[PDB]
């Protein structure tokens, strides 16, 4: 498979776990910071990077009746700036700017325990499907299906729903939403970390999913796997694959890579596009920093790039 290895420039350092890159409507940068602890407890933090100089400012250390969260990955909403973060330990959050939280569930639509939360995606009709690979949310005691199978899948939904649309994976992990040309939500892809495989799904509408496919496959066998993924503007699928030193593309239709990116550390985990650019900015584990490189295009745009009350 061809392999590129693009310059990467540092961005921002020393932040324990570093994951969930997003930008919000106003071009500002976050991250979060999952494996803060305090006295061997839960601490996490999200955190507002300055990319002119690189220094951080924590803006939430969310807990909720003393259980601190494990944020772990982001979108940027688009009728308001306020990041939804998807936490280990908490599962889905609605974080403002100014460093305000608010839990969104302790249950699902059918009353079962919400399960702690991954990573997210908004499609175009602003349905928010997310991946949850830990067990029960705080109070309960923290698990996560990396050996056994009871990974879940939600779908957040405009009417507020918050609706269980599959189970038993062994670690969801990064998910992305491929629309039509025409801006359609038209298919759902799930990484599944340990497996080595990328899923997809036929989205039919809001919290509809069907036709389970074993979609794409990460190389190695190394401890790791498909992490956090987004898509370029041609629908090209980038997938940073822990543990590998790479960053796979995969191509519209899937199946295998058709390139890598050989990045300078191991353990590349989440990813993300600055809008109206070609640059990725990425967050990796080895390091516990951020880097940049430049794709050969720009991203897809997010949720949060595009308009209620557009004409086209
Ligand atoms: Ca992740
Ligand atoms: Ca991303």
């Not at 990041?83 to 569930?105: H, K, S, W, Y």
């Amino acid at each position: 498979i061809p392999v590129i290895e693009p310059l990467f420039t540092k961005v921002t350092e020393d932040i324990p776990g570093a994951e969930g890159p997003v930008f919000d409507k106003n071009g500002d940068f976050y991250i979060v910071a999952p494996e803060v602890e305090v006295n061997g407890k839960p601490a996490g933090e999200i955190l507002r990077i300055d990319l002119k100089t690189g220094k951080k400012t924590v803006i939430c250390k969310p807990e909720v009746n003393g259980y601190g969260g494990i944020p772990a990955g982001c979108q940027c909403d688009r009728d308001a700036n306020q990041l939804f973060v998807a936490d280990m330990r908490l599962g889905l959050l609605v974080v403002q700017t100014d460093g305000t939280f608010e839990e969104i569930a302790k249950k699902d639509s059918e009353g079962r325990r919400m399960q702690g939360c991954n990573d997210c995606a908004f499609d175009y009709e602003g349905n928010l499907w997310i991946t949850a690979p830990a067990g029960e949310v705080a109070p309960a005691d923290y698990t996560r299906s990396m050996q056994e199978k009871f990974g879940s899948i939600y779908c957040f939904t405009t009417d507020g729903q918050m609706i269980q649309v599959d189970t038993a994976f062994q670690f969801p992990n990064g998910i992305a939403v491929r629309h039509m040309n025409d801006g359609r939500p038209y298919q759902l892809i799930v990484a599944e970390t340990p497996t080595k495989k990328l899923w997809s799904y036929d989205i039919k509408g809001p919290a509809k999913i069907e036709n389970k496919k074993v979609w794409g496959h990460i190389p190695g066998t190394h401890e790791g796997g498909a992490d956090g993924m987004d898509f370029d503007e041609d629908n090209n699928l980038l997938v940073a694959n822990w543990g590998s030193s790479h960053i796979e593309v995969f191509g519209p239709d899937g199946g295998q890579p058709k390139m890598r990116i050989r990045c300078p550390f191991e353990k590349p985990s989440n990813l993300h596009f600055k809008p109206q650019t070609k640059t990725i900015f990425v967050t990796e584990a080895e390091n516990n920093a951020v880097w940049k490189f430049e794709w050969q295009r720009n991203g897809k745009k997010q949720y949060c790039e595009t308009l209620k009350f557009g004409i086209f």
